[PDB]
Design a protein around this nucleic acid. Sequence first.
RNA 1: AGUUUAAUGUUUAUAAAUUGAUAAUUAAUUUGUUUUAUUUUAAAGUUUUUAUGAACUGUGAUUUAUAGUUUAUUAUUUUU
Length: 189
Amino acid sequence: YAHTPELRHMADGAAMSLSGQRIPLLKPTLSKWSRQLRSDIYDELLKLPLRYALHDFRTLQAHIHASSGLSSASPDAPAYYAVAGRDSAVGYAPPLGPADPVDVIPFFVHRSSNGHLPGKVYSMNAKTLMPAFYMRIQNIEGDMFRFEEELMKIFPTKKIFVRSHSVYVYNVNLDGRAVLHHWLLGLGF
RNA sequence: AGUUUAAUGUUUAUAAAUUGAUAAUUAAUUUGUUUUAUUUUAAAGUUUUUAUGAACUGUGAUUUAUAGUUUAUUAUUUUU
C-alpha cells in the first residue's frame, strides 16, 4: 500500500529521535514517576495461563457533586474541603489487594518508600556502555521461588535467576519492566 | 632473595537532555546513600644543581760549579 503516500508518519523508534506526539505505538509509557498503564499489555497478562487471577482492568483504573460532579479527590459538596491522598493525575494509587478472596498468594512484593515496584533495569558491564540489560526485583518477600515460576509463564525464554533478596531476569529492556508492573498491579500488589 | 590494572553494585533517596547564543521543553527512557586514589620489573646514551681535586701529570719561582773526556778557544766538539 504505497498508493497512500502518507503513513510515512509511522516510522520507527530506532536510528531516529522519538519524543512528544511521535512515541512508538508499541513502546509503553510507564516510567518511574508516571505510572501509566496500557490495555495491550494487560491482555497479554489476561490471556496467559496462570494462577492468581489478576484484577479486572475496570477496577484497576486510577484514571479514566456540587457543580455537576466533582473530582475524585473527594472535593466535598461545599466545593471546598478536599482530601489529600485521593486523586492523582500521575497514576498513583495504593494496592487493591488480591482479587480472589479464597486464595493465598505465596509471595508479597513490597512497594518502596516512594511507592514504586521492585523492578529496575540495569546494564551488563555499564563501563563500556553495553546495550545488554537485565532486571532485578529487589523487594520480593514470601515464597520467592513460587514467584520465579510465575515469571516463567510470562517470560518463558529469559534466563531467570533467584537469590534470597532479589530475582534476576536477564535480557529484559525497559519494556519488560512495564510488562512486569501491569502484572504486579493487576495482581493486587 | 626476586616484579600490584579493586572479578561483588539489597529496604530511608531523590541523578534525561539541547543552541554556534539568548533561550527553548513531551528533550522520550535507565543506573548509582554519591562508587574517584591504580597502572609492570630491569635497563644504556644523558641532563642538572651544588661541591672537590696540582701528593699525578701539566706550565712559574727560590737552586748560582760532590764526578771522567776531544779541540788553541771563555766558544767547544763533546760527555751524557
